């Protein structure tokens, strides 16, 4: 029995890494290799126009700021399905009450999207179209109000988050901790979700201790980032309030809400 | 790959349960009175219709009010079906125009597939299982509405004879959505490749769940011919209705679906 707890936690961590690799083809490791230095760079309106020829976008059915926002929504819809697939491989998740599964995902996917978005970001821009393109932070910032300000807070979060230097094996456990959050509103069976999250937290803590021995209290630091993810999501939900009440297919509208 | 196809089948069943509150299993339980709950209210004539509208809980003429009730149920189903479609692996990665086309052309085929789950040869469950409207009452409605539901009943009787359950239907409805022959599709092969995988998953599901049912896979695919004819004939009936009725306020969602459809 000596060492068996450790071994079980490392086995869970490896299981989550392996499934994360299957659910998310464009890993942080691959993204960082692209970002450090080939993708087509969109750095202004003109290069965005030629970018449309070099890259086949799937969301084009208008004004440039609106098309970019719709492109981001298309990608987020794809990410919801990748995250839902990944969640099925979190031990315990599929055996939960079906309604609680839906609830956990409804509230979890946005926090996860912005966590994983940081893997594709550096301080100067973001990979798009599976690494085929790179859009500068400055170009996004330049878009007309209120679209100039919709990606900037995500960049702010990502620069700080990426300074933790987490890798894919760390993130796989962290995103599972996020999904198994017992405090989402409307959950029927809270105790089993907390039990699963307890074991995931143990696994995350041991993973960070072994992978980042030089990083004092990285576990605590990473848990604290949950306050900023929740801030980012809340703030982002408010901005989606504006866009639907100041800006402007019926099936298309259905696909997304 | 066997385990991949079983994992696909289980994923679709789960998302089907998440997306469709009134399953065939529940519809069947109500139809045969097997669990708790009080029997549904039976509407078999004009007097029982009048009272059913009082107990079960805005045109004035009866045939139009029933037709509009069917339209409202359809809008609801479209919302459930589109929610389901997003869960089909690969669907949301398609060109967005093709996503819209697949839903435009698939949604009624699925509506009539799942309508069969609420039908027997004598009538159809309505209002979330709180009512049961008889087939003979529906056939009594004035022209051209006495012919509205009858072809759907003819389909349901033949389709229900296949004895599918919800786990079978979840894969079947995904096969319907991922049809590469819809008019106006831009990227056909990505859709066909997905449907190919769904067809492999459906074939294995039928062989495991229905080992004694010879050629059930083929017989189920043959019902796709019958579903297409129900939809195209329903569009025909809509053209007759346009000529026989005064204003028909059609829900805008149905307006877009029907726009330039057959
Ligand atoms: C209380 C009136 C009533 C309530 C629901 C049903 C059962 C539903 O049968 C249906 C029949 C047709 C549809 C398709 C509807 S009707 C139409 O023109 N377009 C549609 O999408 C959808 C459901 N029967 C009678």
Residue numbers in the entry:
A (entry chain B): 203 to 239, 245 to 268, 275 to 461, 466 to 474
B (entry chain A): 207 to 263, 273 to 477
Would you copy out the relevant sentences from the publication that reported this structure?
Peroxisome proliferator-activated receptors (PPARs) include three subtypes: PPARα, PPARδ, and PPARγ; The PPARs are ligand-activated transcription factors that belong to the superfamily of the nuclear hormone receptors. PPARγ which is mainly expressed in adipose tissue, liver, and skeletal muscle, regulates the genes involved in adipocyte differentiation and lipid metabolism. The PPARγ LBD is composed of 13 helices arranged into a three-layered sandwich and a three-stranded β-sheet, with the C-terminal AF-2 helix (H12).
The structure of the PPARγ - pioglitazone complex has an identical space group with very close cell parameters to the lobeglitazone-bound structure. The structures of the PPARγ LBD complexed with lobeglitazone and pioglitazone are very similar to each other with a root-mean-square deviation (RMSD) of 0.47 Å for the 260 Cα atoms of the A chains. However, unlike the lobeglitazone molecules presenting in both the A and B chains, pioglitazone was bound to only the A chain of the PPARγ LBD dimer. Pioglitazone was absent in chain B, which has an inactive conformation of H12. Instead, electron densities resembling those of free fatty acids or polyethylene glycol were weakly visible in the binding pocket of chain B. It seems that the low affinity of pioglitazone compared to lobeglitazone might not be enough to replace the fatty acids in the B molecule displaying an inactive conformation of H12. The major difference in pioglitazone compared to rosiglitazone and lobeglitazone is the shorter length of the linker between pyridine and phenyl groups owing to the lack of methylamino group. However, the ethyl pyridine group of pioglitazone occupies a similar position to the pyrimidine group of lobeglitazone in the binding pocket. In the pioglitazone-bound form, there is no water molecules hydrogen bonding to the ligand. The pioglitazone-bound PPARγ LBD displays almost an identical LBD conformation to the lobeglitazone-bound form.
